[PDB]
From a paper:
BIC, a second-generation INSTI, lacks the oxadiazole substituent and features an extended scaffold that allows it to span the IN active site. This suggests that if an HTLV RAL-resistant Y149 mutant arose, it is very likely that the mutant would be sensitive to BIC. The position of BIC within the binding pocket brings the terminal heterocycle into proximity with the IN/CCD β4-α2 where it has close interactions with the backbone atoms of residues N123 and G124. Although bictegravir (BIC) is only about twofold more efficient in blocking HTLV-1 integrase strand transfer in vitro, BIC potently blocks HTLV-1 transmission in tissue culture, exhibiting a 20-fold improvement in EC50 (0.3 ± 0.173 nM)9 compared with RAL. For now, BIC appears to be the more favourable HTLV drug candidate, however, there are no data available yet on either the pharmacokinetics of BIC during pregnancy or the safety and efficacy of using BIC in pregnant women with HIV.
As in most transposases, the catalytic site is defined by the Asp-Asp-Glu catalytic triad (D65, D122 and E158 in HTLV and STLV INs), which coordinates two catalytically essential Mg2+ ions. The STLV-1 intasome:INSTI structures showed, as we previously reported, a twofold symmetric IN dimer of dimers with the two B56γ molecules that laterally flank the intasome.
Residue numbers in the entry:
A (entry chain A), D (entry chain D): 3 to 39, 52 to 148, 157 to 280
B (entry chain B), C (entry chain E): 3 to 280
E (entry chain C), F (entry chain F): 27 to 112, 124 to 333
Write the structure that this text describes.
Amino acid sequence: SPAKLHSFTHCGQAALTLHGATTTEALNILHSCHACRIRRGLLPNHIWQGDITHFKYKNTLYRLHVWVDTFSGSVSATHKKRETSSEAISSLLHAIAHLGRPSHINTDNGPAYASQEFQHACTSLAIRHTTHIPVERTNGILKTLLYKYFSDNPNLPMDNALSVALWTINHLNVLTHCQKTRWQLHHSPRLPPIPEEKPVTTSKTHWYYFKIPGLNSRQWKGPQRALQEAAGAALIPVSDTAAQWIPWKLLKRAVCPR
Amino acid sequence: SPAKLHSFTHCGQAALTLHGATTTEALNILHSCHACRKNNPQHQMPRGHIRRGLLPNHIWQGDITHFKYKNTLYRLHVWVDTFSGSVSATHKKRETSSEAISSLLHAIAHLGRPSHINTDNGPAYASQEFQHACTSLAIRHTTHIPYNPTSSGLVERTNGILKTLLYKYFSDNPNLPMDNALSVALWTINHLNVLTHCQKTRWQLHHSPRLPPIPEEKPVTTSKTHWYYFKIPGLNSRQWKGPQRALQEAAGAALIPVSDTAAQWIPWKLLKRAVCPR
Amino acid sequence: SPAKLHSFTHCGQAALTLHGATTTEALNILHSCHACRKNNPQHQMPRGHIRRGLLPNHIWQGDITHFKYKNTLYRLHVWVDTFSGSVSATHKKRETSSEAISSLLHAIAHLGRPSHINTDNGPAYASQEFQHACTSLAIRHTTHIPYNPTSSGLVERTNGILKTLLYKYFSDNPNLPMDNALSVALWTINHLNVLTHCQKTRWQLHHSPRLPPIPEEKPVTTSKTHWYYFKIPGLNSRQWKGPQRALQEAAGAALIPVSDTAAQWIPWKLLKRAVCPR
Amino acid sequence: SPAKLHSFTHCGQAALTLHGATTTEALNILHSCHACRIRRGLLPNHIWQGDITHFKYKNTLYRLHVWVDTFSGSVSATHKKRETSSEAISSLLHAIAHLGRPSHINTDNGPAYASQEFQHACTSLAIRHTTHIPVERTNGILKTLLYKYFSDNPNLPMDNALSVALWTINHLNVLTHCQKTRWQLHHSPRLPPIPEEKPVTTSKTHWYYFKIPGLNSRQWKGPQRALQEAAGAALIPVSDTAAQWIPWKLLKRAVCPR
Amino acid sequence: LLHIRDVPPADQEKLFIQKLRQCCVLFDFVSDPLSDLKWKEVKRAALSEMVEYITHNRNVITEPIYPEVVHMFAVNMFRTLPPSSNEPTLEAAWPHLQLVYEFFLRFLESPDFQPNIAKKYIDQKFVLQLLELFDSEDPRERDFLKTTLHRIYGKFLGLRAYIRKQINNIFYRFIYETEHHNGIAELLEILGSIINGFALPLKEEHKIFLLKVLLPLHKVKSLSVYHPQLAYCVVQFLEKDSTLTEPVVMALLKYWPKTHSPKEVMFLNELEEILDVIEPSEFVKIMEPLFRQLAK
Amino acid sequence: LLHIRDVPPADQEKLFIQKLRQCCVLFDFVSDPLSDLKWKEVKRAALSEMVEYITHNRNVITEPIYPEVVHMFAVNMFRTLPPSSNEPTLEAAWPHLQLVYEFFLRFLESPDFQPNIAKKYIDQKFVLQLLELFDSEDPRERDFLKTTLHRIYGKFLGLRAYIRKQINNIFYRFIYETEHHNGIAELLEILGSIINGFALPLKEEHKIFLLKVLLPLHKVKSLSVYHPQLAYCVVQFLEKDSTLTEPVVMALLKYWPKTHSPKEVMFLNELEEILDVIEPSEFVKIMEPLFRQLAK
DNA sequence: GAGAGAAGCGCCAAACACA
DNA sequence: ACTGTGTTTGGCGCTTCTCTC
DNA sequence: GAGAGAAGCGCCAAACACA
DNA sequence: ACTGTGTTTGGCGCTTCTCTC
Ligand SMILES: O=C(NCc1c(F)cc(F)cc1F)c1cn2c(c(O)c1=O)C(=O)N1[C@H]3CC[C@H](C3)O[C@@H]1C2
Ligand SMILES: O=C(NCc1c(F)cc(F)cc1F)c1cn2c(c(O)c1=O)C(=O)N1[C@H]3CC[C@H](C3)O[C@@H]1C2
Ligand SMILES: [Mg+2]
Ligand SMILES: [Mg+2]
Ligand SMILES: [Zn+2]
Ligand SMILES: [Zn+2]
Ligand SMILES: [Zn+2]
Ligand SMILES: [Zn+2]
């Protein structure tokens, strides 16, 4: 339901177009809502930007540690009550867990990112860190989304709102230029290299002996090729008409009959 | 006569054979015996396998585990994608429906939006708040057979792997903060460690192209029923119970009427084949 | 560098391979890691087998089991011949050295005189009276590794078989006296039931001709020692301990020094191979 | 040690001769001790005799239910405090457990062996029971052995003495005529029948794949013949010089290579 | 007609061909939004059934199947381009085109595909007509076109140098004749992937390629829309041989804008990358002129 | 010499033969209890080593081994019998004889033994000399002799009717010529085991055997020492054919002692067994004469 | 100059623990 | 619907290496 | 008159419990 | 010395049977 999705999520109209709603319905929903009415890096996880933002509330302050990829705009945000070097390291590690380990990192000067602890943390991860003193748009859209979520309901633990906002920015909203979501563009597999003077041979997957689950048989029925493989299962076409996901415990490696 | 000898001493098969009996007749006496089958704890039934999704972000599996560190008992909420094995874990202080909802939302922000999720019958998965949160995102939350941890093997095994990595990290630096260790372990599991069989990390499988479609399924099951000796999963008993007739059986379990009032679902691990009374 | 990556994240083998490393170098890093081996509960060590006699009435194996019947907890003293599997069982009211001596004498009167007997470290097998009774008949009574019930597998399995037959008998006639049921079960086991593999009853093997001589044995063992991660059999621990160097190792177990004062005997099931410190 | 064996056991001199002591030493030991100074049945466990004897003590009475095989003299004795049909059935069942199930049984008339309960017990075991009203020597030697044991020490629970006496009568004392112990004569395997006009072929035992214990190998090394088989083990000559008992868990059935 | 999986295997390929022929008819959304709605629904369902069938069975592709599917592709994709209009507009018939692109992608990468059957079915003309489609304004179409052209270039061996000559010619036309183009970034990504697979020693025509169509290409006023990918190409090539870096240095020191403009920063970025590799091997031959040029 | 297992297999059979030859020398305990004590100890140890070696290896028995071991047996067992003296005495050299008996028993029942090699090594003379040894007073010797003769009779096929004729002749001599014999019971047990393996229909010479040497044999005054076994033989034969029971009835009704004596009861026992089988098949042809005879 | 030892590397079945 | 699974580990076959007569 | 279904029978690997 | 083991059980290959065109 695009209507309830926009009520909870407040995502863009294009995101609604990728769902069941079409352009006219997406525009109608977008304009009917009371509340809604360059790149330096060369590859994903190549150069990051690290900002620290103050979130103003009616009776308290929050610290938003934000790491933004310079190639896809992927955002990793962490909420804190104070601001020291230890929490900077914690936010960096959380960003690495969510996105991966970048090769280069960049951030502004301050009490954090300049102590020996942060340099020690970056050294063990083989991350080179540079400092410059004077993106700012992802921060702004994050604050606007948080404000909209708090306007929809004031009874939030400040954690669910942040998690939902990150989900909306990365997985739901779609970029206007490349027509890709930030997660899709960041995690799109790259084009493999093409060796010269050598044909690109098709990769051949091994054959398997398989047993039908739920039959308690003790026979492996024929060496046969696997269409697809996953975690804990693999596609085996049991006949010339249908295929089934067989667990690894019922599969045995084989050799091509030749 | 083999019949009276077995009715008196409950001897074996060859013991009846040496007194004069064909192998089939002795085998028939053994399988037709009523006391000799409830008291034998040996059975042979087909094995079950947890339901696996057809594509990434189709079926998830969640559980809650305890961890002792710095005299504090942290509760790790762990969610695992069934297709690719990707893990999203959040550490909390206590167990509450709000904690479960926050952990689920963090998992959504980290991996994606799942359609179906199944967990055990925990005290926090059956509350009104969790059901409302699940139905707000159009997520179907199901439950397992109570007191049967085998039905959630993937998530429990993931909990074991995560705990082992945490213990490895804490063995070197006991002063390392919990959040740092959890983040490093999650990064190592998702992005560094490769799966044993397919030799691909969980992260490559999760973000592999979704171009392959979803194969069509067939809900047609067996139209016949049999007689089963059953054991209650909650409490372990020395001898089998029944036998009774299953109202309906599916792949992995069967509907066995425990009493004359209400029925129950029994997995294939606690069922034994019976002889036809008619 | 694979070294720093593994020292930071403790990743797997192929994770180091994709960052640039030969398979042997990554394998060497994995086996040379100190934290990665104590925290992994997986090991692969040779299996042990209980000592078996060379002829009937050579080695016996005894244990005590409990049975609930008519609101009374009878204690069954069970002795089994290791060569043939013949069973002699006596039911008593309580556990006392006098009861053990009487049960042993009844077993001697029923089967024969054994040379060596081994039981666990029970409260009744270590008293002065039992030792005096054993040495009066020139019977060598040994002991097992404490809190290791696996070393007495034959007698525990015999206890299970005897209890199963008793339960079968009591399922039909609940008013049957205990002594009648025990006598019938003993007769069925010794004289009627045939062994699964050799297809000969215990009674034929026990009274088979003693014409075959005793094969000569060789007490020569390995002259080398290794380093082992060890776990105390009494208490289960999550991670391995050590590593230490065994004073001497035999077939099935090894002498591992738990502390700097006294050593201990550890079975092969709770030992893990280590890397040479030198 | 024959001396201590006679001190505890008080067996015959011939039993001492079968041990390390010889005829002269056996005679010397026998005469130095202060205290010691037809068949109707055709086969073992064919016809029995059942007697009930009263054992006189200094302050109490005991009941000895004795079953004696008519072909070998094997004795099965049970001690009781009373005498009813139920204890007669219990003694019969204990005798069956110790010796086996006889085809014919015989005993004197009395309150026991004549009730419906005893006939019902004998009917289920396919045992035909006959009664006659007028061996007595095995009883007498049993009483003498019990008296000697009580004379050696008065502090016995009346159970150890009986168990030792049964052990001595059946396993230690040797018959004068056939030079066999009662257990040996009772349980000596009978001569198998000889088919006519057909050679008695030698029984051939199956071959086995075996693994050496304590090596953690995953290889089965050669199909080879087993010399002897027992409970939980089997003799396999690992080389042309020595043989070893291999457990069944490390043995796999095979077929003759031909 | 009928479901492709509900027919016996004797004539299964016959219905395969027949259902492939069903989608050969055109359906235009630009002419009017509502026209032959149920025909379009049947076409979409048939395309979905074909794309799900092709990726679940083996030994499906046969000799009389290779032409027609490509012809079907030839019927739908190769056409006159929409008029130029300079948020860019989305192509009206995107559903059908997306399904056709996915089906062609699965057809080419199937393990049963033999690269020796299409050699006299796929020729230079097919590559020309496909490359002329890269001018499309739709970004999703550009993505699918680049991910298809990569596979086409990789699989075939006799169609490589011809594509290289064609990309050189189109680069010459773009830099000299007509400055209107929208698919610079995707082609640069494909070229970088090709560059990554070169061997040693580097051949001379690669040097001609970089000196003629790569370095002068920086003069385009619209560099900012494709600044990273182009840079990556340079950062992909020079690692094979560090001796040839100096002509790149003189090129970047001459194409640098001598006047103040926001365009300077991007240039610095590329230089930074070059700097991060130019320090080793004692490359100080042109360090002083470069420092003098960047001083101003 | 040397241990049999500590020699290479090339000459292992040579030392096998040599150590077999070592025990060929005699040692008499009857002449004097103390004579060549260490020689006797070496002989006993060698016999134990041989009997343990023979039952732990395969492919050991070879063509030149069959004679000599039997000859060794022929050296030790076949000899003049000790003088008769009517608790019976025990033979003085029992240890060596027991080891030799066990070794011969293992030699004959080994799976490597071929029953076609000893056919021209074991002849009728060997069986005569072995059967003449059954007169021995030692009961253990009688037991080992019967358990050896059973195997010898079972394994060989051309030595059966000759043994039957010989047992008939010795029975005739025992019942008519000389009444002094001590091995009635063991031979009767062997005969009963042979009877158990008969087939249908029963041949005539079996009827002659029972009528001539079985039924009249009851007249012996020393029946009580072998009463069960003989009876068992009858209880073993009549089950093959119940038609031939009547001549046994007239025999037992004529050999019954007409005067009072303790010997009556044993006869009744046999009759009881016969009765327990004679009731079916409507056997009342001789019931009245039997009742009249037992009435007196 | 050539063939037997030595280091490398892909594979697997029995074990363990997840309250 | 309902339903056990993924990682660690020494032993071993196959393959490519080099010091030695 | 002859060859495909049907009853018989020996064998085995994964499971279970012995406090 | 020290040390895990024996029974139960449906599925399946090999073999010997008989009702049917
Ligand atoms: O036995 C457990 N693990 C060990 C184990 C395994 F992991 C996998 C196996 F194949 C076998 C195993 F023995 C286990 C137990 N419980 C729960 C688990 O999730 C759980 O894994 C859980 O959540 N509850 C809640 C619902 C009612 C309350 C709370 O008790 C149950 C307890
Ligand atoms: O765990 C036991 N059985 C289950 C079992 C098995 F049978 C075989 C296996 F491979 C594994 C198993 F888990 C078991 C426990 N104990 C004793 C046993 O004999 C015994 O079998 C015993 O006598 N003692 C005394 C000495 C100190 C006190 C008393 O505690 C111990 C307890
Ligand atoms: Mg759990
Ligand atoms: Mg125990
Ligand atoms: Zn809105
Ligand atoms: Zn039964
Ligand atoms: Zn490590
Ligand atoms: Zn005495």
